Scaffold this motif. Structure first.
Motif, PDB file in Angstrom:
ATOM      1  N   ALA A 182      28.969 121.592  34.041  1.00 60.13           N
ATOM      2  CA  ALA A 182      30.233 120.939  33.715  1.00 60.13           C
ATOM      3  C   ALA A 182      31.017 121.731  32.678  1.00 60.13           C
ATOM      4  O   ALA A 182      32.246 121.836  32.766  1.00 60.13           O
ATOM      5  CB  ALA A 182      29.976 119.515  33.220  1.00 60.13           C
ATOM      6  N   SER A 183      30.326 122.286  31.680  1.00 53.31           N
ATOM      7  CA  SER A 183      31.007 123.069  30.654  1.00 53.31           C
ATOM      8  C   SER A 183      31.662 124.311  31.248  1.00 53.31           C
ATOM      9  O   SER A 183      32.793 124.657  30.888  1.00 53.31           O
ATOM     10  CB  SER A 183      30.025 123.456  29.549  1.00 53.31           C
ATOM     11  OG  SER A 183      28.988 124.280  30.053  1.00 53.31           O
ATOM     12  N   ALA A 184      30.964 124.995  32.158  1.00 61.24           N
ATOM     13  CA  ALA A 184      31.514 126.208  32.756  1.00 61.24           C
ATOM     14  C   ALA A 184      32.763 125.909  33.577  1.00 61.24           C
ATOM     15  O   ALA A 184      33.737 126.669  33.534  1.00 61.24           O
ATOM     16  CB  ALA A 184      30.457 126.894  33.619  1.00 61.24           C
ATOM     17  N   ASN A 185      32.751 124.810  34.336  1.00 59.99           N
ATOM     18  CA  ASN A 185      33.931 124.432  35.106  1.00 59.99           C
ATOM     19  C   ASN A 185      35.112 124.131  34.192  1.00 59.99           C
ATOM     20  O   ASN A 185      36.245 124.541  34.472  1.00 59.99           O
ATOM     21  CB  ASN A 185      33.619 123.227  35.993  1.00 59.99           C
ATOM     22  CG  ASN A 185      32.597 123.542  37.067  1.00 59.99           C
ATOM     23  OD1 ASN A 185      31.557 122.892  37.162  1.00 59.99           O
ATOM     24  ND2 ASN A 185      32.890 124.544  37.887  1.00 59.99           N
ATOM     25  N   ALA A 186      34.869 123.410  33.096  1.00 58.52           N
ATOM     26  CA  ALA A 186      35.926 123.170  32.120  1.00 58.52           C
ATOM     27  C   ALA A 186      36.362 124.469  31.452  1.00 58.52           C
ATOM     28  O   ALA A 186      37.553 124.676  31.197  1.00 58.52           O
ATOM     29  CB  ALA A 186      35.458 122.157  31.076  1.00 58.52           C
ATOM     30  N   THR A 187      35.407 125.353  31.153  1.00 59.05           N
ATOM     31  CA  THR A 187      35.749 126.652  30.582  1.00 59.05           C
ATOM     32  C   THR A 187      36.541 127.497  31.574  1.00 59.05           C
ATOM     33  O   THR A 187      37.468 128.216  31.184  1.00 59.05           O
ATOM     34  CB  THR A 187      34.480 127.384  30.144  1.00 59.05           C
ATOM     35  OG1 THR A 187      33.729 126.550  29.254  1.00 59.05           O
ATOM     36  CG2 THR A 187      34.827 128.685  29.435  1.00 59.05           C
ATOM     37  N   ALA A 188      36.195 127.418  32.861  1.00 60.59           N
ATOM     38  CA  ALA A 188      36.909 128.164  33.890  1.00 60.59           C
ATOM     39  C   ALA A 188      38.321 127.645  34.125  1.00 60.59           C
ATOM     40  O   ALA A 188      39.095 128.307  34.824  1.00 60.59           O
ATOM     41  CB  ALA A 188      36.128 128.131  35.204  1.00 60.59           C
ATOM     42  N   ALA A 189      38.674 126.490  33.566  1.00 62.15           N
ATOM     43  CA  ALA A 189      40.021 125.965  33.702  1.00 62.15           C
ATOM     44  C   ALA A 189      40.998 126.812  32.887  1.00 62.15           C
ATOM     45  O   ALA A 189      40.636 127.827  32.283  1.00 62.15           O
ATOM     46  CB  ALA A 189      40.069 124.501  33.271  1.00 62.15           C
ATOM     47  N   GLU A 190      42.262 126.388  32.883  1.00 60.75           N
ATOM     48  CA  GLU A 190      43.356 127.075  32.202  1.00 60.75           C
ATOM     49  C   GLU A 190      43.619 128.462  32.779  1.00 60.75           C
ATOM     50  O   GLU A 190      44.307 129.278  32.158  1.00 60.75           O
ATOM     51  CB  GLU A 190      43.103 127.162  30.689  1.00 60.75           C
ATOM     52  CG  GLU A 190      44.360 127.252  29.836  1.00 60.75           C
ATOM     53  CD  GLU A 190      45.213 125.999  29.909  1.00 60.75           C
ATOM     54  OE1 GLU A 190      44.661 124.914  30.188  1.00 60.75           O
ATOM     55  OE2 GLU A 190      46.437 126.103  29.687  1.00 60.75           O
ATOM     56  N   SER A 191      43.087 128.745  33.963  1.00 55.60           N
ATOM     57  CA  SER A 191      43.324 129.998  34.660  1.00 55.60           C
ATOM     58  C   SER A 191      44.326 129.788  35.790  1.00 55.60           C
ATOM     59  O   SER A 191      44.655 128.659  36.163  1.00 55.60           O
ATOM     60  CB  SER A 191      42.009 130.567  35.203  1.00 55.60           C
ATOM     61  OG  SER A 191      42.228 131.776  35.907  1.00 55.60           O
TER      62      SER A 191
END
Ligand SMILES: [Cl-]
Ligand SMILES: [Cl-]
Ligand SMILES: [Mg+2]
Ligand SMILES: [Mg+2]
Ligand SMILES: [Mg+2]
Ligand SMILES: [Mg+2]
Ligand SMILES: [Mg+2]
Ligand SMILES: [Mg+2]
Ligand SMILES: [Mg+2]
Ligand SMILES: [Mg+2]
Ligand SMILES: [Mg+2]
Ligand SMILES: [Mg+2]
Ligand SMILES: [Mg+2]
Ligand SMILES: [Mg+2]
Ligand SMILES: [Mg+2]
Ligand SMILES: [Mg+2]
Ligand SMILES: [Mg+2]
Ligand SMILES: [Mg+2]
Ligand SMILES: [Mg+2]
Ligand SMILES: [Mg+2]
Ligand SMILES: [Mg+2]
Ligand SMILES: [Mg+2]
Ligand SMILES: [Mg+2]
Ligand SMILES: [Mg+2]
Ligand SMILES: [Mg+2]
Ligand SMILES: [Mg+2]
Lengths: 197, 126, 106, 156, 61
Positions: free
Chosen positions: A177-186
């Motif tokens: 879940a953290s990685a998907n949120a981190t992968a956002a804003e792209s």
RNA sequence: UUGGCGGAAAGGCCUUGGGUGCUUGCUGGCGAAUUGCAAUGUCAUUUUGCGUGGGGAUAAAUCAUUUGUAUACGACUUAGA
RNA sequence: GCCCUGAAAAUGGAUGGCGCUCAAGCGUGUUACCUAUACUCUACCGUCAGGGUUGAUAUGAUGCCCUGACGAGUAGGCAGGCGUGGAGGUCAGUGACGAAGCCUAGACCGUAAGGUCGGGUCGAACGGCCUCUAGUGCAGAUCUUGGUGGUAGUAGCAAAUA
RNA sequence: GGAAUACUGCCAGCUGGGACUGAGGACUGCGACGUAAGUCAAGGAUGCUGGCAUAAUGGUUAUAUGCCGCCCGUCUUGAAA
RNA sequence: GAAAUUGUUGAAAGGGAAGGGCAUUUGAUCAGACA
């Protein structure tokens, strides 16, 4: 939709669940029922115990081995309720009954699979609050079921292993879940957001 | 070869068998109307055999027509075969069962010359 | 890809029937994902095929097909009525059928 | 005499047909079918392919092209009831298709002329295809139904 | 279901042809059948019906 | 291939290491036709049999005889290189 | 009003069964839906009724054709047909190059009674049509005569000392 | 004070999808659209195209599956009795 | 040289009868047009 549907019998009303399963089998869907000892029947415990004793006294007079068979196990009690809703004396009815399996507890083949519920037959969603109900596990014991303690001990062991599996699954999901949120804003994330995904 | 005809419809292809002809050997399959007072067949109860009636009659435009579209006419020699000379599109010749093998050869040869269809040309062939 | 399906899955439920008498000339078909008579209007007239296997090979194949089509809706739960060129056998109650997307009005 | 000859014989003459009142009138296609629309083939050898609709022929058939250089579908005829019209369009102005008619696809290896005019038609189409991104990759892929896909609620 | 007010498939009850097999009598019936159809004269219809009568219904004159 | 776990019908789950194939994460270049306007257009797993060669293992039961803890007859229970 | 007490019968037991408790129960209201050999439209069969058409050179005026309506049935009545023995006439009919009979989950015609054909077996007479005639059609009558089953390799074949 | 909408009813208003049916067999009738010649959805289906030409469709027969089906005859108000 | 009834061979079905009606699957078998 699944090739095999596994239903957790806990918290389900026996009659309403039996109607749902009988139609599924006749339509060609394989069904597996687990934890039949956690089934519920509306009405007080004394009422249902009296009803079973009325069933017990029915037997062929000249030979008891010919008369109706009184199965005491919780799985076979649910099977009796289901066989009455199927034309079991026909080849079509026999084939439908071979698409069903009922177990007490959750045996090893199905303890690592997904269990579903039937909202139409759920006691919490059907019975009016305050109404009295009975549990199939204790009713079976009073009419001569011998394996209530064995199932209880095995189910306790299964839950210990199942809880340990869930703890590791929770930890991995937090990482994902953290990685998907981190992968956002792209840019790719923004384009997916415009299309609904 | 026959004249064009509408599609042939058979309202009831199944044979009408006498009731209980499959139950006793002494009861033949030739159709007989049940006349008993209590007979379920006569009273037409559900699930029993059906009975012949005029409603099953075939269309008059296709009645008596063979699947090839011709009407069968039994012949016994050359002389009565020639009665179909001008009616080759409506009638087909059938050779009688008691015609000798050598006489069938003469009839078939004449029928081929006249263009008359024969429904049983393989009978008594050496 | 891993999927090549161009049809909608369906189930053969039974014949048209009253309580005691059935009509083999009409079959009742349940379409997956359809639960409303309004939604079942989309599939009216679509071709239906029943595909089964046989041991004997006839026309260079061991697979045989029975063709049909959707005629009208049935009930309030998205069931539809279907008619086949040859009536479906009664042993296929609960078997799978294929509902194609042609003829198309899209 | 084995059988008595009938006294009456039916006439061998065949009667003429009555005058029929059924005038052929041109087909009206559904509004979704416009030249340059991407179509999904629902049956045939090229089922599931995404092709480009070009012209409406005189025998109530649709002229389509892959193009052959993109997904390997050549100039063919298809039936309007066996295709699905999508919402995406490709400009067709600049493509010469008046040479292709019903007689062009007469039945009677591959001929030489079929190869040449395939490249002439495809070259104009490919130029228009490059205008929008990811459209060439879209035409190369095949359409299929996934689990949970309900055609009565899908928009094309 | 139909609530019939009269008996169904009831014959007229009148002779439409002679009962006899006399060839010459049938020729007279054929002649006056044509006359009754295409003359609108009441005399021809009366004669045609009289030819169908039985012996007791045709007393000597 | 390494290690661990699972007996309720475990016959499964997890993990270590290397080899090899693919990768549509991105950019290219070739091939497709003619199944002729649709025809499941054949891509699944059940069991068994006959021929190939690569390993593995070299018994019993019944009848007849005999026993009486058995027995209407079968059956049962004993003995005999 | 609902529920409860009042409320006791003999094989085991029946709101049809399973089962059901904000019902899948009771009272009431609003819609959707299921299906009869009934109703509506169409085709086909038959029946009845009202009509058209003799003109030769092509055949059925009991013919052909147009229009409308109708179709349950014991006892019983009437009509049109199928089949059997024999008789007059006719087909200059079939047949030892195989008549009749018999067997045939082979073919065709008829709503049906039935008719026709192929194959096998067989050996000496037999059929179509127009008419005449009757000792003319069987599932039953504890029917007549003859033949044959299940029972069944069963009951049993043990008085009179061996 | 000025509208809208609901409910009910009418249209010789328009239009999309699905199913069953194709009886009849030269012409004749009543109409429609047209200055006209003609045409037409106007007293009952035609046009175009594909595959196969054989057990493929179909018939017969045995079997399987769904639903249904009590033993005929006779007397009787009433018979599977 | 028929039937009842019986033997052998071949095919098929059979969880307290068997047989039948409507429809279709499967197996076996078969006529009709190639104009
Ligand atoms: Cl012993
Ligand atoms: Cl007949
Ligand atoms: Mg006990
Ligand atoms: Mg018949
Ligand atoms: Mg009575
Ligand atoms: Mg009758
Ligand atoms: Mg109520
Ligand atoms: Mg009706
Ligand atoms: Mg009547
Ligand atoms: Mg002979
Ligand atoms: Mg026989
Ligand atoms: Mg002799
Ligand atoms: Mg007598
Ligand atoms: Mg008789
Ligand atoms: Mg007798
Ligand atoms: Mg009698
Ligand atoms: Mg007797
Ligand atoms: Mg003895
Ligand atoms: Mg004795
Ligand atoms: Mg003695
Ligand atoms: Mg068939
Ligand atoms: Mg019944
Ligand atoms: Mg009495
Ligand atoms: Mg009786
Ligand atoms: Mg002898
Ligand atoms: Mg015999």
């Amino acid at each position: 939709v699944e090739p095999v549907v596994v239903i957790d019998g806990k918290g389900h009303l026996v009659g309403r669940l039996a109607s749902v399963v009988a139609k599924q089998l006749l339509n060609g869907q394989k069904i597996v029922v687990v934890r039949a000892e956690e089934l519920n029947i509306s009405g007080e415990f004394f009422r249902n115990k009296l009803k079973y004793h009325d069933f017990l006294r029915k037997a062929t007079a000249f030979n008891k081995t010919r008369g109706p068979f009184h199965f005491r196990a919780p799985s076979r009690i649910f099977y009796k309720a289901l066989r009455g809703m199927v034309s079991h004396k026909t080849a079509r009815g026999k084939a439908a009954l071979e698409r069903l399996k009922v177990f007490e507890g959750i045996p090893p083949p199905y303890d690592k699979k997904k269990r579903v519920v039937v909202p139409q037959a759920l006691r919490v969603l059907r019975l009016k609050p305050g109404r009295k109900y009975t549990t199939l596990g204790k009713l079976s014991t009073s009419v001569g079921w011998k394996y209530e303690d064995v199932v209880a001990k095995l189910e306790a062991k299964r839950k210990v292993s199942s809880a340990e599996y869930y703890a590791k699954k929770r930890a991995f999901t937090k990482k994902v879940a953290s990685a998907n949120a981190t992968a956002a804003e792209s840019d790719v994330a923004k384009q997916l957001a415009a299309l609904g995904y | 070869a026959s004249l064009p005809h509408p599609k042939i419809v058979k309202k009831h292809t199944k044979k009408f068998k006498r009731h209980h002809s499959d139950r006793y050997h002494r009861v033949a399959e030739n159709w007989r109307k049940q006349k008993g007072i209590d007979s379920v067949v006569r009273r037409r109860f559900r699930g029993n055999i059906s009975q012949p009636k005029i409603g099953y009659g075939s269309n008059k435009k296709t009645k008596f027509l063979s699947p090839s579209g011709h009407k069968t006419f039994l012949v016994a020699n050359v002389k009565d075969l020639e009665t179909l000379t001008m009616h080759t599109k409506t009638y087909a010749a059938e050779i009688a069962h008691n015609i000798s093998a050598k006489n069938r050869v003469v009839i078939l040869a004449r029928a081929k010359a006249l263009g008359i269809k024969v429904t049983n040309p393989k009978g008594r062939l050496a | 890809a891993e999927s090549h399906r161009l049809y909608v899955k369906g189930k053969h439920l039974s014949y048209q029937r009253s309580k005691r008498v059935n009509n083999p000339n009409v079959s009742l078909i349940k379409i997956e994902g359809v639960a409303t008579p309004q939604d079942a209007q989309f599939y009216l007239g679509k071709r239906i095929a029943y595909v089964y296997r046989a041991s004997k090979e006839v026309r260079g194949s061991k697979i045989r097909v029975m063709w049909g089509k959707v005629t009208r809706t049935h009930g309030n739960s998205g069931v539809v009525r279907a008619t086949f060129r040859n009536n479906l056998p009664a042993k296929t109650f609960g078997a799978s059928v294929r509902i194609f997307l042609y003829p198309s009005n899209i | 005499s084995a059988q008595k000859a009938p006294k009456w014989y039916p006439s061998e003459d065949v009667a003429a047909l009555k005058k029929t009142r059924k005038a052929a009138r041109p087909q009206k296609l559904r509004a979704s079918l416009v030249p340059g629309t991407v179509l999904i083939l629902l049956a045939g050898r090229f089922r599931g392919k995404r092709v480009v609709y070009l012209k409406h022929l005189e025998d109530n058939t649709l002229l389509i092209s892959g193009p052959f250089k993109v997904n390997g579908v050549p100039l063919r005829r298809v039936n309007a009831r066996y295709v699905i019209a999508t919402s995406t369009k490709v400009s067709v102005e600049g493509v010469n298709v008046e040479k292709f008619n019903v007689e062009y696809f007469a039945k009677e290896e591959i001929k030489a002329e079929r190869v040449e005019d395939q490249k002439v038609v495809d070259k104009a189409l490919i130029a228009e295809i490059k205008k929008t991104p990811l459209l060439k990759q879209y035409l190369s892929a095949s359409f299929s139904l996934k689990n949970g896909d309900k055609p009565h609620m899908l928009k094309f | 279901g139909i609530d019939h007010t009269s008996k169904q498939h009831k014959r007229s009850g009148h002779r439409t042809a002679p009962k006899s097999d006399n060839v010459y009598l049938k020729l007279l019936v054929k002649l006056y059948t044509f006359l009754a159809r295409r003359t609108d004269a009441p005399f021809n219809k009366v004669v045609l019906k009289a030819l169908f009568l039985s012996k007791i219904n045709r007393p000597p004159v």
